[PDB]
Amino acid sequence: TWRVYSTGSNVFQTRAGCLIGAEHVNNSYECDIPIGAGICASYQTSQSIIAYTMSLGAENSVAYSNNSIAIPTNFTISVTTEILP
Amino acid sequence: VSMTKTSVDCTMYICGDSTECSNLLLQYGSFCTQLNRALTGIAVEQDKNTQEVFAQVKQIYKTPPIKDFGGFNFSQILPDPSKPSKRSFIEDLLFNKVTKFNGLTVLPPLLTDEMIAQYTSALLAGTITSGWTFGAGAALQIPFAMQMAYRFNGIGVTQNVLYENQKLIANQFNSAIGKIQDSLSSTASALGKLQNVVNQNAQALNTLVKQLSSNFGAISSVLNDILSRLDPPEAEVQIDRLITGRLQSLQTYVTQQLIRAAEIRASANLAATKMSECVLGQSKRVDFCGKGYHLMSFPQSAPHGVVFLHVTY
Amino acid sequence: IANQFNSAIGKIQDSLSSTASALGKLQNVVNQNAQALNTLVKQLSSNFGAISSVLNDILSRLDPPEAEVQIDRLITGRLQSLQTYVTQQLIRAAEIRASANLAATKMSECVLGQSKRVDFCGKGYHLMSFPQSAPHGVVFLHVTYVPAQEKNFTTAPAICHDGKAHFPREGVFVSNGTHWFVTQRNFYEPQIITTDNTFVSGNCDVVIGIVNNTVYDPLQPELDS
């Protein structure tokens, strides 16, 4: 019976359906709330829910030649944690 | 690796938009709640299986513009930027070999086909350029003619065999990839493991629809037929035979889906283990990354699965 | 190394005391068993097509010709609630069986020894792992070796000095622009090229990319003295 969110000017058409009450941007961030088909949702700043395309990480190209090598000079020691029932 | 997702309405499958049927469904307890809770945990778990296998690294690498790999031709596994679908040539052949309104629906997956192929192109650029160092720390550049000198030493072969026979191993490597393009395109029975997932899940959906024509000892199989011919003193007896008949059909579909969801979960953990022991490094286990002495592996994309490519000695 | 190891366990003590989101796998085990037992005791209030939901309500009001009809709708409705609870607990026991065998495999490989498998006992080159206790679970602390700082160099696959090709025994060749050295692949230690670090095999007219350099002989100052 609720039709308070059908005012308009926020409608964006996705592949899983349509998302109303949220704005669409053109940037790409790491999302936490999944929607479907790559579209995500978050809370970014006077703050509103935005929707964007899920990114896959920062770009990092590497050099490659016939006479190029990379040897490390220093190291760190790190301790992680794993929990299994 | 994964399985397609589904969602079954509890009230729409039993009661055909009728209020007289839904008044008797509330006396059976929380049977409509447990069916939606079990199908929710399956659809979440199918999205987790594609993250432990493909999303192993969080740094998207890229192919260098100069293709100087020392006589090795990787022109069949690298993606094509001119095509609208960013896939390789072997990934295009693997896609063409695999093939309602009663409350049932199919939810789309989160990770689409273009984001899976970018994971494969990032892991292919790390194995060729960096090698076995992009999985333990940062990426270190090693030439491809010097990468196999360490891979030969891991199986007990000195580096004099590789360097003095560079024109023979590079000719056998390019001739081996070209044999896969003739073996897959001719015989279509090699992808029978992926077609057994979409066929056994389609038989369970057609069984729920064809079971709506049963009577279960009632007069007819239409809910509008019994409410139009009999009186509500007597109409509730025939609805009781149709609710209990359709409730055992929904408990059968969820229980058979929960057993099949454990074997795909058991197969996704095996694919996540081979994506780090055979691809991200050189393994010494016999009959794990192929028959013989394993050297390197290359991953490929597939619908509802993964396809490996081992290189042995 | 001992200063980085003692400062690494201190970063686990503040992460485990600030938030409780790290134990999310153990929280879903207790919450699923508490939700299955709560739903089973809530189905005793249903009717399942009978006249009442209390067995004393039907027995103290109706006649034994009729009392066998309404009780039959209650035994049938309550037996299906137990068959669903037992079957769901039998599938959940298969998930905890796969996690118990994985915890026993990492106890014998990562804890009691050292594994050479990539991304099994931690991210990186595994060195040590200490087990800890947990309610209905186990917690591992993987000590790993990760390189941090890098530096580019110019390499070569082999060298030849007087017609005979020289291959490196353990490591690769590097060059800072003037001289050539032999270093390892995980740490940078420049050493001079000698006969104890090389391996002679054939001539240098076959290997592609070979450069010209000199190999030091350790028998030069001792035989002249």
Residue numbers in the entry:
A (entry chain A): 632 to 676, 689 to 728
B (entry chain B): 729 to 827, 854 to 1067
C (entry chain A): 923 to 1147
From the study:
The spike (S) protein of SARS-CoV-2 is a glycoprotein that forms trimers protruding from the virion surface and mediates viral entry into cells. The S trimer uses its receptor-binding domain (RBD) to bind with the host-cell receptor ACE2, followed by a substantial structural rearrangement to fuse the viral membrane with the host-cell membrane. The Delta variant harbors multiple mutations in S protein, including two substitutions (L452R and T478K) in the RBD, the D614G substitution, a cluster of mutations in the N-terminal domain (NTD), and two more substitutions near the furin cleavage site and in the heptad repeat 1 (HR1). Here we present cryo-EM structures revealing two conformational states of Delta spike and S/ACE2 complex in four states.
To visualize the impact of the substitutions on the spike conformation, we prepared a prefusion-stabilized trimeric S protein of SARS-CoV-2 Delta variant and determined two cryo-EM structures of the Delta variant S trimer. The two cryo-EM maps, including a one RBD-up open conformation (termed Delta S-open) and a transition state (termed Delta S-transition), were obtained at 3.1- and 3.4-Å-resolution, respectively. The population distribution of the Delta S-open and S-transition is about 75.3% and 24.7%, respectively, displaying a considerable population distribution shift to the open state than that of our Kappa and Beta S structures (both around 50–50% open-transition ratio). There is no linoleic acid (termed LA) in the Delta S-open and S-transition maps, as in our recent Kappa and Beta S structures, obtained in the same construction and purification condition. In addition, in our Delta S-transition structure, the three protomers appear asymmetric, and the 630 loops and FPs are partially or fully disordered, which is usually the case in the transition or open state of WT/G641/Delta spike. Collectively, these features suggest that the S-transition is not in the closed state, instead, it may represent an open initiation transition state with its RBD-1 in the initial stage of lifting up. Compared to the recent study on the full-length membrane embedded Delta spike, our S-open appears more comparable to their S-open-2 state, and our Delta S-transition is more untwisted/open (up to 6.5°) with the RBD-1 tilted upwards slightly than that of their Delta S-closed state.
